[PDB]
Symmetry: D2
Subunit: 36 residues, 4 copies
């Protein structure tokens, strides 16, 4: 897989989860685009 | 403070969106700190 | 189709574009649930 | 103030809340730059 470091200085754990959910939204889109 | 995230398959523009979301959250917190 | 209004006061066209993109991602997630 | 209309077909209530939060983050950024 591929893992990247991000600077999340000052972000709360609730903020982190919002960032994680944004990553998942993008991955879900790519899982649809890859079908064709 | 540095976290790693799995970004498998994310394009270059996808990574940009993630970086911008992070920035938006930092600014909200600096804007809370300039209360 | 379902159309809703949002207060977007002070948002630039580029901020609006970011909102539209977020809506698009949310719709895709609902499609993906159907598989 | 300014409102705009968006097609949100299929979005759940919680989905709509995520959109509203993104708007508010964008508004806060502008309130900070000013
Ligand atoms: Cl991860």
């Amino acid at each position: 897989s591929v893992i990247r470091f991000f600077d999340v200085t000052g972000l709360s754990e609730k903020d982190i989860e919002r960032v994680k959910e944004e990553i998942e939204l993008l991955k879900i889109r790519n899982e649809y685009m890859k079908l064709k």
